[PDB]
UniProtKB/Swiss-Prot annotation, chain A:
Entry protein name: Minor capsid protein 3
Native organism taxonomy: Viruses, Varidnaviria, Bamfordvirae, Nucleocytoviricota, Megaviricetes
Subunit description: Interacts with the major capsid protein.
Function as written in the Swiss-Prot or TrEMBL entry: One of the minor capsid proteins that constitute a network internal to the major capsid proteins and outside the lipid membrane. The minor capsid proteins glue and stabilize the capsomers.
Residues of the full protein shown: 58 to 114 of 171
Domain of life: Viruses
Induction context: Expressed in the late phase of the viral replicative cycle.
Subcellular localization, as worded in the UniProt entry: Virion
From Swiss-Prot, chain D:
Sugar-modified residues: N279, N301, N398, N405
Coiled coil: none
PTM annotation, UniProt: Myristoylated at the C-terminus. Glycosylated; highly branched oligosaccharides. The pattern of glycosylation sites are unusual.
Species for this entry: Paramecium bursaria Chlorella virus 1 (PBCV-1)
Protein name: Major capsid protein
Swiss-Prot record, chain E:
Key words, A-Z: Capsid protein, Glycoprotein, Late protein, Lipid-binding, Virion
Annotated function: Major capsid protein self-assembles to form an icosahedral capsid with a pseudo T=169 symmetry, about 190 nm in diameter, and consisting of 1680 major capsid proteins trimers. The capsid consists in 5040 copies of the major capsid protein (hexamers), 60 copies of the penton protein (pentamers) and 1800 minor capsid proteins of different types. The minor capsid proteins form a hexagonal network below the outer capsid shell, stabilizing the capsid by binding neighboring capsomers together.
Gene Ontology molecular function: lipid binding; structural molecule activity
Protein's UniProt keywords contain Glycoprotein: yes
Induction of its expression: Expressed in the late phase of the viral replicative cycle.
The protein's name in its UniProt record: Major capsid protein
Swiss-Prot record, chain F:
Known function: Major capsid protein self-assembles to form an icosahedral capsid with a pseudo T=169 symmetry, about 190 nm in diameter, and consisting of 1680 major capsid proteins trimers. The capsid consists in 5040 copies of the major capsid protein (hexamers), 60 copies of the penton protein (pentamers) and 1800 minor capsid proteins of different types. The minor capsid proteins form a hexagonal network below the outer capsid shell, stabilizing the capsid by binding neighboring capsomers together.
Signal peptide start-end: none
Transmembrane regions listed in the UniProt entry: none
Additional remark text: The viral capsid possesses up to five major capsid protein variants. They behave as asymmetric capsid components.
Protein name: Major capsid protein
Upper taxonomic lineage: Viruses, Varidnaviria, Bamfordvirae, Nucleocytoviricota, Megaviricetes
Sugar-bearing residue positions: N59, N66
Whole-protein residues included: 341 to 437 of 437
Protein induction: Expressed in the late phase of the viral replicative cycle.
Family: Belongs to the NCLDV major capsid protein family.
C-alpha cells in the first residue's frame, strides 16, 4: 500500500464497527418492537367495534 | 496454461462468446423485503390417540404461513423390524379448510405414495428418520416423529398462505389419526397389549413481514396458483393365479392435472404395494425356515423388485380414445419417474405425468380433466402363479407373472394432482373453480 | 419472536434489504403455450438379435420430440451377480441422423462413462434398475429393461427436435446391438446354451403444440445449440510390475469442447475400469480360497477403490503447452467431479472440464480444438506390482502402485463433448459445422 | 386420439395456465458469455509442513480471478481399516483467509465436519468422504492422497470469484494449521503411532483467465461482493449426568446479518465424535462383541444418525431475552430444520437453526442481524446420562429424555454462525465494509 | 398468551419463591391449605386443590383484562404439569404404584359491565401497566466443604 | 424493609423499589439501559456434619452443612413493568426488551 | 517490553500502551466502545506429582 | 524462550520502522541458529544423544 492508495484507506478493510453505541446510552434503544398479534382474525371482532348498540341491546 | 485455451478462439465460438451478454464472475443478489420466520406451537382441539380425530385452527401469530410439521411421540409395540413409517401411518389424513370451504386434503397413503415418487436420496432418508425407527430401536423405545405437511403452501415460500389477507375467514386443519398403527398398537390383526397412545403437537412456521409488505398483503387482493390433491380409492380387479385380471376404472377427476399416480396395496399392511415372498426382506422371516408369506417384514415392507408388483400394463383413455400407447407396469414404475422426477420409485407404485417437471411448482404442462366427458384408466394384472415360498420361483420367473400372494393386493389408490386458483380478496377467499 | 428479528435492523442490512427488489412470499408462475405429451412406439427396421445393426425412422405423430427410450427384453443366463448393466451393454451404440447427416453417436461404454460421471444418487440407482438385475434375480429371470437415450434432445425440452420444422428431411436412429452380453448370452467368453435373442422396441415421446406455437415452428428458421460426442478408442501403454509406463496421446478432437472424459478398461468385461483383486466385489469369489482375479464379480464390476485404478498422473497440453499443472489420476477421478458435477465417479473413470458447469445445457467455457493443431493427453501409469490374490498386498499398498491384474486394462477410451449448431430452415436441416 | 385429444380439450381452467402465454419450454435461447478459461496452479507453501505445524501460502498472481482452493495431503494409515475418520479433514486444523494483511475469514477442521454434516449430501457427501478418508477397507501402511476443498465464499461460486488483479497493492494469503495428531494416521486414541510418517502437503488454486475486455474491467472498476464469513467460538458444555438434565445459557458473542447458527457437542479426543459411545453396531470400538468398549468409538463409523446417542434434549435461541421461537427438541434442530431448509440428512449430535429460507444458498433469504441484538443467548437442555451404554437393551429401548452414560464425554461445544459481509475492492486494495 | 404474544410465564418454583417473599400470615397459610395436605391426611386421601394464578390481572380488578376491547384477539393459558409430584406419584425418585392421575379444571372469574362502562371499554384504547416475570435457571457455584 | 412478611431460609430478595409488593411503581431499575448487570455471590463453607445437630446449631456465620452442597440449582428471577396495549380491538406489548 | 522489571510466575500482563508504567497515555483500549470483551484462557494439564 | 531483538527499531517507538513508507522494499530477518547449544544438544564437545 503506497502513495494515494493509503489515502483510500477508508475503502479497504478498515471496516467500521457496526455496534455504534453500547446498551447504556442508546445502542439498542431503537430495537424495541411491540409484540402484537401481527395478523388478527377480524371475523369475530367486526361485530363489536362498529355494532356496539346492537350488542348492548 | 489457461491462456492456451483463450487464444484458441475461432468462428465456432461466436455462438458462445461473441457479443457476450453475461458473465459468471459477477453475481448480483436481489435486495429483498425484510422478514423473519418463527416456529409456533398450535393448540389442538380434542384428545389425540388411536382412532381419534382432532383439529387445529391456525393461530394468527404471523402474517403469512408456510411449513407445517405434525409431531408425534410414539412408543414401539415390538422390536426393530415391526414398524414401517408409523408416524406416516398414524396421520391418516389432513384436511385444509378456509372460510368453511374445503381447499385440499392429504391421506397417509398419499404421504407414502408421494414420498415413494417425489422424495429422494437423503431427503427421503431424512424423511424416513422423522417418521420411523431406523437405528434398530427396541420395544418400548420412545421417539418424537416429525411428519411435514405437503399442501401447496407447505412446499414453497412462493405460496405462503396470506393469513393476514383472510381477515374474515378462519383457516383450519383437521387431522385424522389412524385406528391402528403397525408395530405401535397392532401387530398384523392382533392388538398389542399395553400399547401407549401417541402424544401430538402441531407446529406452524410463520412469516413476519415488515411494515410495507404487511400492509399490502392485508389490503390487496391476491391470486395464488395452487396445487390440490384429488383421490379416489377403489376395488382392484382381484388379481388371479390362473389368468390376467383386467380393469377399466372411471377417472373421476377434474381440473388441469399435473399428474396421476397410483398404487395397489394390501390394506392390512400399511405401505405394502407388492406381494410377499420368501426372499430376504420380502416377508416376515424371509429367507429362512420361519418365513411366512402371510406377513411382511414390516421394517422392509417396501421393495424395488417389480417381480412382486401386480400391474402388467396400463393405459389412460380419454373419451374412448387412447391418450397414449399401452405401456408395461415397469414403464410407469421406473421410466416415468426417471424422466419426470429423477428419483427412484418402489415397486408397486406408479406414475404418469402430463407435465415436463411434475416435481416442480411451475405448471409445465397439464391435462384438463374438467374438459373430459369420460376419463378412464385401463389396467391389466400379471398372472399370480408364482410360489411365493420358493425363491427359485420368486426370483427366476418371467416378465408377465407374479407371486400367488399378489392376489392380496386388492386395493387401488388413484391420485391426481391438479392446479386451481386460491383467490383472496377483501379479507375472504376460496377457490376459483369448484370442479 | 420473529418480530424481534425484523427490528434488529441497521447499516449492515442495507445490502440485503434496503431498497428491496423482491419478495419470497409470492411467486409468479409464467403462463405457457398449451402443450401435450404422447409416448408413441416406432417400428424397427432390420433384424433384432445379438450383434445385429437395426434402425428406426421417427414418425411424424406430433410436432417436437424429446425423450427416447429403447425397451429391451433380456433374460438371465446365470445367477445374480453374473450381469452388469446388461441392457446398456446390449446397446453397443446408437446414432442420430437428420437428412443423412450424422448429428451424434453414443456407445455402450459411453453410456457407462456418462453415467459414471453425470448421473447420481437415486437417479443413478433408478437408471441401474432399468438396465440391470438388482434384486438378486436368478437364472432364467426375464426382464424388460428401458434404456433412455442421451442425445441432446433426449435430455432437455429446450432442444426438442423440431420434427415439424424438418418437413423435407427424415430423422433416423441407428442402433448396434452387442454380439455378446455378459450373463445373458455369454459367461465371460463361454456361450450360454439356450440363450434367447432380445426383444427390442423404440419409444419416442412427442410434444403436441398449440396452434400458434406449431405454426411458428413449422414456418420459421431455427438454430438449436446442441451437444455432440467425439470418440476414439486406443491402446493403453500398459504398465507393469517393474515399470511406470507413460503415454502421449494426440487428441484428434475439434469444435468448442465442454469437457474431456476417459477411462481405461478391459474389453472383455463390460464396465471393468479397474483391476481385479481378492477383496470383496473385486473378483469372482473374492474374499475366499476360490477367488479368481482373472474374472470380476460382474454384479459388482464397478468400484470406488482407487487402489485398483491405473492412472498415476495426467495433464493436457495444447500446442505443446501445459493446459494445467500435472495432477494425479485421483484428481481427475474424485476432484473434478466434485468441482464440476457433484456426484461420485467410480475408480478408473476420469474427467477434465474446460467448463465451469459441464453437466448443464448452457455454455460455461469451452476449449475450441478446431484452433489447436496438437492437443495431447499425457498419461503416467501406476506400477503394477501388487499381488492381487493377497488382500493385504492390495489394501495396505502405496499411492503409485496397483494390482498386477491392472495390466488387463489395456484399452483406453477418450471422449469429448462439444457444441455445434443444428440449423433448420426451408423444412431442412443439418449442422452449422461439418 | 393421442396427445392431440388433450390439446383440444381446452376451457376456462386452462386460461390461468396457458392464456396469453408468456413462455415455452421448447425453445431455449442460451446466453452469450464472456470468454474465459480455468487453470490449476500449484502454490508455494512457506513454512514447514508437519504435524502440529503452521504453514502459509500467498496466492500467486497467475490469473485474474480465483475460485477453488484444494489442499492436498499425502497420509498413511497407522492402523487398519476402521481406525480413521476423515483424517485429511482432521489434519487441516484450520485455515485463515487474509487480504491486505487483514482477516476476512477462518475455518476449522470441526467446521468442515459440521458444514459437511449439514450441507453436503447424497453422493456429493460420499465423494467428499472419498477425498478425505479411506473408504474401501484399506489396511495399515496404505498411502493415499487426499483432497480437502475449501469453502470460503470464492471457493463455492465463480459469482464471488476474487478479482486478484484488482488488488494491485494487496495480496491474498492462506494460513494453515496442521493438527498435532490425526486419528489413525499418527495417533490411535491417546497413543502415538511409532514410525508414522509426516504429511506431504500441496495447495492448489484454480485461476480464472479472462479475455482482454473483462480483465481490464476487473483491474479498473471498484467491486463489491456480498460474501460469507464464519464466526466461531468454543465453549465448555455443561456436563449432564445420570442424575440430571443439565441446563446452560450460552451468551452468543456474534455480529452481522446471520443466515444461520450451527452447533455441535463433541469429545475433543475423537475428531467428529458428536454422539455417545455404545455397545450397538458402529457405536463403539468392538461394538457387538466381547471386546466392545464404550470408551473408544469405531472410528470409521464415528458419525451416526442414531439420535439416542445425542446429548441435547432441547433448545431455543433468545434475542435480548425474547425467545426467537418456541422451544423445540434437539431432534427438531437435527432432523427438521435441515429437512425444511437444506434437504440433506444431518448426523446425530449436530444441530442447525436457520434465520434464512435457504441457509445453503448464495442469495440472502432472511438473516438475523446480531449486531443489533444486545444479548443473544442459546439455551440448551441436556439429556439425562443414565443409560448403560454397554447394554443394547438399555441403549436402544430407552426414552426421549435420556441418553448414554457415555454422553458425558461430549464435553466441548462448538457454536458457529454464518453471516454476510461486503468484500470491497477499490483502487488496488481489498476491503470489508463491516467489523 | 394474548393475541399470540407471550405476556408472561410462571414456574412452580416461582410460585414457591413468590409465596416465600410476598404472601404472609393467614394468607400464606390459607394458600398452603389450597395446595397441600395440612391436617395430617393419610395415604389414599383425595383432595381438591386450588392454585390461584399470579398474573398481573389475577391480583387486582385494577388490571382486569379487557376481553371486551380485544375483539380481534384470543386469550389463552398454557399449563405444564409436572412429570412427578412428591408424595403423590413419586417418593423421591421412586414411582408410587397405584398413584392416581390428576383431575384438572380451569376457572375464570368474569366481570359483567353495564352499558355505559361496557361501551367505553369496547371503543376506547387502553394502556394497562402490567407486571412480567423474567427468569433464567443457572448452575450454582456450589460451595465446597 | 420493603414487604413486611417473613422470608424462608435460602430465599433472597433485593429491591430497587420502595414497595415491590404493590401494583403501583415505586422505583425501578431499568435494565434495558444497562450493559453489564451482574449478581455477585459468595457462598458459605460446607464444613458442618449435618448428622450431628450440635455441629450445626452451635456453629458460626460463614459456614453451613456438608449437605448444603446438594443445593446446586440457582433460580434468579426479576419482576418488571411493561405495557399491555389494547386498541381498536387488538393488543400487544409496548416493549419487547 | 513494556515495564522493564521482572514479573513473578502466575502474574500476567497485557498492555495496550507503549509505556504502561508511566503517567502519560501511550495507547489505550477503549472498552466504552466494546460491547463484548472476553478473555479466553487455556490452562495447563495438572498432572505432575 | 523468547529472544527480543536489539535492532534500532526494537528499542523505541520513535524509530518504529515505517513499513508503510517502504512500499516497494521488503523487510527481512535472517536468523542463523548455532550448530551447537550448550546443555541442549551438546555438553562441551560431546553431542547429546
Amino acid at each position: 500500500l503506497s502513495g494515494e492508495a493509503a489515502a483510500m484507506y477508508g475503502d479497504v478493510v478498515v471496516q467500521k464497527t457496526t455496534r455504534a453505541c453500547r446498551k447504556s446510552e442508546g445502542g439498542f434503544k431503537d430495537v424495541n418492537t411491540e409484540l402484537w398479534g401481527t395478523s388478527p382474525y377480524l371475523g369475530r371482532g367486526d361485530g363489536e367495534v362498529y355494532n356496539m348498540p346492537a350488542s348492548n341491546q | 496454461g489457461g491462456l492456451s485455451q483463450l487464444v484458441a478462439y475461432g468462428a465456432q465460438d461466436v455462438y458462445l462468446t461473441g457479443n457476450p451478454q453475461i458473465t459468471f464472475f459477477k453475481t448480483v443478489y436481489r435486495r429483498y423485503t425484510n422478514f423473519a420466520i418463527e416456529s409456533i406451537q398450535q393448540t389442538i382441539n380434542g384428545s389425540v390417540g388411536f382412532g381419534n380425530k382432532v383439529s387445529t385452527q391456525i393461530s394468527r401469530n404471523g402474517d403469512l404461513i408456510t411449513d407445517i410439521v405434525v409431531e408425534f411421540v410414539l412408543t414401539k409395540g415390538g422390536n426393530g423390524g415391526t414398524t414401517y413409517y408409523p408416524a406416516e401411518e398414524l396421520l391418516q389424513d389432513v384436511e385444509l379448510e378456509i372460510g368453511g370451504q374445503r381447499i385440499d386434503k392429504h391421506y397417509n397413503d398419499w404421504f407414502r405414495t408421494y414420498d415413494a415418487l417425489f422424495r429422494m436420496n437423503d431427503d427421503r432418508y431424512n424423511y424416513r428418520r422423522m417418521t420411523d425407527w431406523v437405528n434398530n430401536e427396541l420395544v418400548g423405545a420412545q421417539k418424537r416423529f416429525y411428519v411435514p405437511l405437503i399442501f401447496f403452501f407447505n412446499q414453497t415460500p412462493g405460496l405462503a398462505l396470506p393469513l393476514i389477507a383472510l381477515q374474515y375467514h378462519e383457516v383450519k386443519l383437521y387431522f385424522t389419526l389412524a385406528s391402528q398403527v403397525q408395530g405401535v398398537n397392532y401387530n398384523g390383526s392382533s392388538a398389542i397389549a399395553g400399547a401407549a397412545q401417541p402424544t401430538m403437537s402441531v407446529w406452524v412456521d410463520y412469516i413476519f413481514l415488515d411494515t410495507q409488505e404487511r400492509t399490502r398483503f392485508a389490503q390487496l387482493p391476491h391470486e395464488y396458483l395452487i396445487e390440490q390433491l384429488q383421490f379416489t380409492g377403489s376395488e382392484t380387479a382381484t388379481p388371479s393365479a390362473t389368468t390376467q385380471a383386467s380393469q377399466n376404472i372411471r377417472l373421476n377427476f377434474n381440473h388441469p392435472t399435473k399428474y396421476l399416480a397410483w398404487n395397489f396395496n394390501n390394506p392390512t399392511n400399511y405401505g405394502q404395494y407388492t406381494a410377499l415372498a420368501n426372499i430376504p426382506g420380502a416377508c416376515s422371516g424371509a429367507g429362512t425356515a420361519a418365513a411366512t408369506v402371510t406377513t411382511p417384514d414390516y421394517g422392509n415392507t417396501g421393495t424395488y423388485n417389480e417381480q412382486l408388483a401386480v400391474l402388467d400394463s396400463a393405459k389412460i383413455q380419454l373419451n374412448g380414445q387412447d391418450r397414449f400407447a399401452t405401456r408395461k407396469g415397469s414403464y410407469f414404475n421406473k421410466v416415468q419417474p426417471y424422466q419426470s422426477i429423477g428419483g427412484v420409485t418402489p415397486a408397486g407404485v406408479y406414475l404418469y405425468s402430463f407435465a415436463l417437471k411434475p416435481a416442480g411448482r411451475q405448471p409445465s404442462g397439464t391435462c384438463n380433466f374438467s374438459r373430459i366427458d369420460n376419463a378412464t384408466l385401463s389396467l391389466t394384472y400379471k398372472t399370480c402363479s408364482i410360489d411365493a415360498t420358493s425363491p427359485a420361483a420368486v426370483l427366476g420367473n418371467t416378465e408377465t407373472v407374479t407371486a400367488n400372494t399378489a392376489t392380496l393386493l386388492t386395493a387401488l389408490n388413484i391420485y391426481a394432482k391438479n392446479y386451481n386458483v386460491l383467490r383472496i380478496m377483501s379479507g375472504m377467499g376460496g377457490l376459483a373453480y369448484a370442479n
